[PDB]
Amino acid sequence: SPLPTRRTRTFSATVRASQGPVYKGVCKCFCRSKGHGFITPADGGPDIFLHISDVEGEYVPVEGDEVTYKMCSIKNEKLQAVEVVITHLAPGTKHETWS
Amino acid sequence: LPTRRTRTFSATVRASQGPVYKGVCKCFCRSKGHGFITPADGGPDIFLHISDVEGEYVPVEGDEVTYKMCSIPPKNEKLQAVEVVITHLAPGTKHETWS
Amino acid sequence: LPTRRTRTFSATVRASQGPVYKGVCKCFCRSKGHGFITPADGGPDIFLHISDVEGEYVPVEGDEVTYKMCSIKNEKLQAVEVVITHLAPGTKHETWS
Amino acid sequence: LPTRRTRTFSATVRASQGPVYKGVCKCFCRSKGHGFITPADGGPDIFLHISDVEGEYVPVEGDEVTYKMCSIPPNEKLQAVEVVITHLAPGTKHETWS
Numbered sequence: 161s162p163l164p165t166r167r168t169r170t171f172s173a174t175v176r177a178s179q180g181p182v183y184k185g186v187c188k189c190f191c192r193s194k195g196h197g198f199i200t201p202a203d204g205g206p207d208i209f210l211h212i213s214d215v216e217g218e219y220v221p222v223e224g225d226e227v228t229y230k231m232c233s234i235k236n237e238k239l240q241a242v243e244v245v246i247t248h249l250a251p252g253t254k255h256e257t258w259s
Numbered sequence: 260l261p262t263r264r265t266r267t268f269s270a271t272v273r274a275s276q277g278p279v280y281k282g283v284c285k286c287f288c289r290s291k292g293h294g295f296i297t298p299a300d301g302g303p304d305i306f307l308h309i310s311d312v313e314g315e316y317v318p319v320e321g322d323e324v325t326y327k328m329c330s331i332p333p334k335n336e337k338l339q340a341v342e343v344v345i346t347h348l349a350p351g352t353k354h355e356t357w358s
Numbered sequence: 359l360p361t362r363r364t365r366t367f368s369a370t371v372r373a374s375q376g377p378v379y380k381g382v383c384k385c386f387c388r389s390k391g392h393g394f395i396t397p398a399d400g401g402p403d404i405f406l407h408i409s410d411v412e413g414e415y416v417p418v419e420g421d422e423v424t425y426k427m428c429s430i431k432n433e434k435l436q437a438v439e440v441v442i443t444h445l446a447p448g449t450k451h452e453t454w455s
Numbered sequence: 456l457p458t459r460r461t462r463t464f465s466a467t468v469r470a471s472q473g474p475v476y477k478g479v480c481k482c483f484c485r486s487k488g489h490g491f492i493t494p495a496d497g498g499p500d501i502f503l504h505i506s507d508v509e510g511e512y513v514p515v516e517g518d519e520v521t522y523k524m525c526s527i528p529p530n531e532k533l534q535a536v537e538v539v540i541t542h543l544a545p546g547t548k549h550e551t552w553s
Contacts (some may be wrong), residue, residue: 166313167357173313174300178344180326216263216342217271228275242313243342245275246268256262269377277375278477278495278521300519300542303368328375333401334429335376363552367540370510374521374539412459412537413467424471424495439509439537441471442464454460 163196164214164234166242177232178243185241187225199227199241208241209234216245218257224250261331261339263310274329274341280307282340284322284349294318296326296340312343315356321349360430362409365438371411373428373438381437383421383446395423404437405430411440414453420446457527457534459506470525470536475522478535480544483514492520492535501535502527508538511551517544 167196169177188207198207208231215221226248231242248254266274285304287294295304305328312318326340348354360369384403386393391408404427411417422444425437445451457463462470481500483490501524503513508514519542522535543549 167315169314171314171316171348172273174344175346178313178342216275217266217268219268243275245271247272250269267377273375273377276473278475298542301545302542330372330374330376333427334433334435335372335427338372338375338431363511365510367510367512367543368492370539371541374509374537385518412471413462413464415464424458439471445464 161209161234161238163211164232164240169232173232174242177230180230182228182230183241184247185204185227185229185244187221187223187246188225190221192220197221199229199244204241205210208239210241210244214226214240214242216243217233219246219249220248220256220258222250222253222255224253226250260306260308261334262308262342266329266341267332269297270329270332271341274327279325279327279342282324282326283335284318284320284345286326287318287320289317296324296343303338304305305338307343311338311339311341312345314345315358317355317357318343318345319349319352319354322350323347323349351358359407360428360436361407362438365428369428370438373426376426376428378424378426380443381423381425383417383419383423383442385419386417388416393417395425395440396428402435404435406437406440408430410436411442413442415442415445416452416454417442418449418451420449457525458504459536462525462536463528466525467536468527470523473523475521475523477519477541478517480514480516480520482539485513490514492522492538499533501533503535503538504510507534507536508540510540512540512543513550513552514538514540515544515549516549518542518547519544 184202195212282296292309326343374433378397381395384394477495478492481491489506525534
């Protein structure tokens with residue numbers, strides 16, 4: 161897919177997203193050097209695509225990290241997460257900040 | 260003075276969990292990377308950093324915005340706008356994109 | 359000596375709007391109406407005034423706590439919106455009455 | 456009836472643990488030590504005891520506020536705790552305790 165960054169979300173796309181509900185989920189995947197990953201919804205579902213630009217906080221996300229996010233459709237059905245916050249850090253792994 | 264990938268784990272957390280406010284962009288210099296939002300309901304203006312702004316448009320004086328609030332540790336001496344969305348375009352200035 | 363009905367408008371908003379820290383009640387003399395909290399994560403102790411304590415229990419050395427912070431007119435730190443999360447095992451705990 | 460000194464240990468934790476809401480001071484009578492907050496989302500006015508107010512100002516109708524929520528035990532009825540005046544109501548005069 162043409163990568164839907166946060167500096168790229170259309171005006172309305174962004175406003176609609178921000179007005180939706182807040183979801184809980186877990187970080188399944190994330191490659192810092194690629195700029196993306198996925199998030200396994202809580203309340204079960206297809207994994208939501210995750211772009212590095214939509215991430216919030218000093219920390220780089222890691223598999224098993226708990227997250228809250230809003231959804232934003234991409235121009236088909238695919239789903240993206242926006243306004244993404246790490247709620248719980250996964251114990252055991254090393255957690256790293258950007259920089 | 261802090262940015263998105265700089266904002267401590269929990270500041271990010273508690274901000275995201277707070278209420279949403281409406282304001283108006285009062286300042287913003289892209290060269291410099293910050294501006295100010297005067298809250299609707301008047302009062303003190305809130306500091307605003309470019310990395311905390313979502314969507315494709317660059318904020319401009321007069322833009323309506325929803326945002327969340329959050330303070331600047333360890334001392335919480337000043338407030339800051341986070342999760343900041345342009346909701347209504349300042350009707351008279353012509354607008355650009357980060358591109 | 360800032361207290362809750364004395365904290366200025368901006369300080370209150372600004373504290374209420376910062377992170378939530380964990381710590382431990384280092385001491386508390388009720389008759390004096392204050393004490394200290396020690397930050398979890400190490401750091402300088404935090405002034406703790408009685409008016410900022412929320413709940414039926416008087417605080418005791420060892421009580422686990424959460425709080426918001428607020429620099430005091432340069433800066434000392436005060437703890438605000440202060441919650442006892444676990445009671446101190448050794449000691450006996452009183453109520454405010 | 457419950458106050459910030461009367462609030463059970465347990466109640467206090469959950470209250471603080473829960474979400475933060477926005478609202479507006481519906482009323483408040485300092486003489487009586489209580490008023491109401493109209494929730495912004497929408498819904499029933501939240502009871503508000505004086506003890507739970509932080510800051511130097513006595514609350515005024517139209518003051519805009521954040522707060523966490525609490526339930527009054529036998530529950531049902533709700534209450535507001537950790538109550539911050541985020542925005543001063545512009546029209547009237549604003550006072551302070553004392």
